[PDB]
Amino acid sequence: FRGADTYSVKYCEQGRYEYQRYLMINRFPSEYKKHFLSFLSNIRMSSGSAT
Amino acid sequence: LKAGLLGHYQQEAFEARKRFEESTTYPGPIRAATPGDTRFYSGSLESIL
Amino acid sequence: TEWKLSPRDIVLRRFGQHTKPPGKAALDVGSMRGSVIPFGRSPGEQLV
Amino acid sequence: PWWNFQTEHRQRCVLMYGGARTKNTHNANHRVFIKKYKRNAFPNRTRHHWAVSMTGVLSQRPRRMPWPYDLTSLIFNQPRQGSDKIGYVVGTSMLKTAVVATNHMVYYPKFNQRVSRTKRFFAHDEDLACVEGDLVHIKQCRKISKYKHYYVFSILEPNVEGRERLKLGLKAVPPPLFGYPVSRRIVKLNLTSTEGTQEKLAAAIQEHVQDAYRFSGPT
Amino acid sequence: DTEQNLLAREQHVRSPAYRELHRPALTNAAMGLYGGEPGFEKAHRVWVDPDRPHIKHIYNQTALARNLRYARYGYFKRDMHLLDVDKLVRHARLLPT
Amino acid sequence: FDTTSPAVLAVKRALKCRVLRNHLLTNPHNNIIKTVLANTERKLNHALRRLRKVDFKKYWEIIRDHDVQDILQPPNLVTYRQGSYWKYDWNAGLAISTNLADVMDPRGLNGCVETGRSRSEVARDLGLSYTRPLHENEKKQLSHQAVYYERLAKFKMEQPEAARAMERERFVRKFSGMFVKMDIRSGAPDFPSTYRRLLGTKVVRWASKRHGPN
Amino acid sequence: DERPRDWTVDEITAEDVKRSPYKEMEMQPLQNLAPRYEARPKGYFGRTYYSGMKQS
């Protein structure tokens, strides 16, 4: 069963990240505020012995 | 609702809108009022804290 | 001139107002008991 | 070879539980129905159970499934299913709550057809502008009341006749003359004089006595 | 002259025969069990007044409780000695000349 | 040479319905005129329902002039409850027929996609008022909110020895309750619907599991 | 002192502010919070990424 089965040449000649299509992932504006505040808090973490 | 009548409605959504911008005369740019706050955030209920 | 129409006699169907029902135009899902295939089960049938 | 989705689901089940599925689940078992009650004396008022009833929400026959391709998916780009909806206002008897009837599609693959079902939602309008007859666009939100998690985002089409009838001091929509009945018994309207109501009451109580006599059965 | 005709109607409404005749439908807990017993598996006969109804939407269009056909003239020909012709002219279907 | 305008076709159907009703009055045993009247009334309903959407001023003039205000009413409540009476406007191609600039102000009819504000909050931030003409009960609902607050505040100021006992027994009933711990069961919005398997054999407080549209 | 030192119209006041709002910097390092990474995978859990359950 499928002992000799080959795939296309396009799969092994493609570059990286060229298959990803542009998707417009919309969300709620409260989720926009929550994710923006979470990313702003994660960026502003002080550099201690854990970061 | 019936989705097959959507695109013809889109033509009406064109044919009214192009009718609007040629009918009325814009007097001038109205100044922008500041937006308030909505009480309809998504997700669960937040706290008063 | 005048319109003496009353909508109560229209809705409640006074004077025996009879609307003829359509002919087998029910189109419900519960009565159907057959699997629908494109071109039917036997598409080209010739009566010999 | 290109494996199907069932291979991926089996891989997920193997990585979760250690194994895919124990074998011999069919067993061809003869499920026999043993009746206990009398012939037309089942203890229910609407649905009388007399056969083996299948149990299952999405694994029953004839098979249904939600059909995500409708007007709402064509108009609105949604973050999740049921976030934005478009419907009609049918009831404004509650304060700050518009009853919005919306439609969705259910797919039957056996008959290969989609059908439109209707769901009623309670939406919120603060300034009391929604009139019965408005094509409105509602959106999901937080819990406002026990049955209010939607709100009127936009009025896509206002009912002009309803607003003009409200300006006249009338109702926005004239109320229907038909509706839900009160019993399966034929609700006869009693039109009698003020003196002929006692004999009509005697006839009604005699009819109720004969309906109770139906408990006796033969003779 | 109209106060007597109003007050007789208001005293006829508050009479015990009118309130017993226009009782609402009996509930399933008032009739008895969940069903199976003949005569007690449904409610009893409900009579409504067409001018002062104790239910909303007197008529309906259901499959089994359909009652618009029973509102026409002829079902009130059974009791013409007790009949009120004012409500007969106002509330009946297919009345003759 | 115009005879097919909707305002003309509607009054033609209404005059035809008047003629058929006047024939059925003097001769109620004519069975063909019954069916013709039942078809002409449905066609009159269709003509007036399209006239309401394509030219509202002439429709309102026809409604006002001939003493027929409720000629466009839903027949059945059960069909009206599911929005099938208003689905006629979408299915016939009449949903975008009314010009919004000539009737209302369309700035406060659309919510904000950027800020997520509602339809009412955008008009609130613009200083516009969109409120339907209320009835007496709808004004009684909004006017009697302050009256009970002034009554309860006057009772708290005027009878302290009774208000203190009422608040004390209310706090005793609140504090000593069994389900006072905030949990998933106490935090559910609909307890008979989420936990419906307890309503038969365990909980006798709720006799049914359905109270709303959910 | 019942009025806080940084009282604006939007009524957002810090309890441990201890400084005039004109003296404090606009952006500073946050030492009170803790950096947290994603610990719950949605659809991908293991050996072979076929689809990843991206619709979920």
Side-chain angles (χ1 to χ4, degrees), chain D residues 125 127 129 152-155, chain F residues 108-110 118-123 130:
Chain D
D125 42 329
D127 57 341
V152 183
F153 184 79
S154 296
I155 302 178
Chain F
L109 289 180
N110 308 313
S118 176
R119 195 259 328 143
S120 58
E121 295 156 337
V122 173
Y130 298 89

Side-chain angles (χ1 to χ4, degrees), chain E residues 38-82:
Chain E
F40 298 94
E41 83 291 325
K42 302 184 302 294
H44 280 170
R45 181 56 56 90
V46 181
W47 304 86
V48 293
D49 193 74
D51 299 280
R52 204 181 87 99
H54 73 273
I55 54 168
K56 48 186 298 183
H57 309 296
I58 301 176
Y59 312 98
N60 61 293
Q61 293 178 341
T62 58
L64 263 53
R66 180 200 323 265
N67 75 321
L68 186 63
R69 200 246 184 263
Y70 289 83
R72 63 199 291 259
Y73 173 74
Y75 296 92
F76 315 105
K77 274 190 61 182
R78 192 61 213 281
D79 35 272
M80 305 191 74
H81 296 258
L82 318 171

Side-chain angles (χ1 to χ4, degrees), chain F residues 76-87:
Chain F
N76 194 19
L77 175 78
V78 195
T79 62
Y80 180 79
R81 226 163 156 270
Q82 315 293 328
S84 68
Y85 182 75
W86 308 117
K87 222 181 302 175

Side-chain angles (χ1 to χ4, degrees), chain F residues 191-202:
Chain F
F191 196 87
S193 180
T194 306
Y195 307 94
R196 54 182 59 184
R197 55 167 213 88
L198 309 179
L199 304 180
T201 69
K202 189 165 298 300

